[PDB]
């Protein structure tokens, strides 16, 4: 039929440059576990497709005064992409402008440690001032803390949302980055599933710590009645019940794995 | 509107008995998982309910001859009920005939053993005779092994299928009977969120054992197409994200825990 535009965000190990991609054309300049799950979906599903990384680098939140959205979440609301194949979660103010299949992995908010700071848990980190702590920008993680009625997590976003210097990030890779380059003096709230991929990889300095915040699920997006939805969801079903879905996890973290 | 008739199926800790229920009438002879979920989706899509017990105890399966469906995804395709909220877990064959939720909890298959049992794994399982093993009828579990294409599982069912006497059950006590009652000789595998449950209730005598061998979730079921569908999905992403699902899973599991 038409050619399916793609749209992604490059966040490892889901999809990230190959150190050659400069030689590379089209879909071959990218790798990782989503690059690899949309082409399953697209040979299960019969479409041809392009992958494209979002414009803005985000995921997708809603101006409060302009009520425009940002991110893989706008790209599809506005008519620019035909579905997003992403770690995008699953929220209940994106349930309601946007198509979700099921989920095709599970992850929790976590907490992110350089190795060795006296941190255990959530509430740990709320009866503190020595380590700042913050999250991502623009995603689920920082809207859990903005909107939770749950104490040790209002106390969270009090101090956060007032903290100077700012403890809130753009990407991922600057939040690692704070992490190791501030002697553990800084602690990052993130996705279980991102925190757990970092920790096998060199020079291998942070750690998972505590149990997850929160359960829930990253599923492929389409725009509000699209008729992609349908059959990209019984491929992801198909996927899961043929271990699929496990092979590319074990292919992605831990085949990867550099810490041992 | 009218009253919903909701399907369920008498399984613990979700939709189990009161002691007292001769005493008691209608939605008050029941308590459990479910029967406090089936309250909130209530609320938060304003309906009124009737709870049932499948008439037939099962989950849902279709018969290979006459392609009947039984068990509650039989009673929501024939119309016998609006609404099914059960531990029914969300597959690929059900998808295509009724509409589900999101899913409201997590889980994967798992070996319950008598304590002191020498196994570990279903690799373990696979190699030995000595102790028997086998699943529940009529769900998502016998179907899982008997469509695997994992050497591990196929050797599994080629057992299973052949074993005399059947290592086949027809409810999760009797599984969970046999393994009390069989001195170490009998492995049951069943849904991990049940193991974990029997796990901790009197007299502690049994025990999950290794890691899960899939990842999969429950959601409520509709009718194909049913107006309910909609409402009841958001409300299920409204009580996640309020941690009431978290609260409930506590409440019928770990502060119910008679182990410690
Ligand atoms: N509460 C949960 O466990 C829950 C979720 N549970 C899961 O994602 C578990 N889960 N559920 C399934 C599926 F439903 F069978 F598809 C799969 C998985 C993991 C592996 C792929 C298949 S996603 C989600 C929630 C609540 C908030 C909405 C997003
Ligand atoms: N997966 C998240 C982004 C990462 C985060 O918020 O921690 C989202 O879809 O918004
Ligand atoms: N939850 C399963 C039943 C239990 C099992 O198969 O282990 C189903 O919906 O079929």
Redesign the pocket.
Known sequence: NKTVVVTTILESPYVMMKKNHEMLEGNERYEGYCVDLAAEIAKHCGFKYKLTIVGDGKYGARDADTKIWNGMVGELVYGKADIAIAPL???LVREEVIDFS?????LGISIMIKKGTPIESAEDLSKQTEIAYGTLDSGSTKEFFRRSKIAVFDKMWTYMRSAEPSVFVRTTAEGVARVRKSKGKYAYLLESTMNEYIEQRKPCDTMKVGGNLD???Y?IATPKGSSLGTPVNLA??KL?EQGV?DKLKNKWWYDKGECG
Chains 1, 2 share one sequence.
Do not use: A, E, N, W
């Not at 099921?102 to 599970?106: A, C, D, E, N, V």
């Open positions: 979660t699953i929220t099921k989920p095709f992995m599970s359960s829930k699920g599923g992801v079903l899961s879905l």
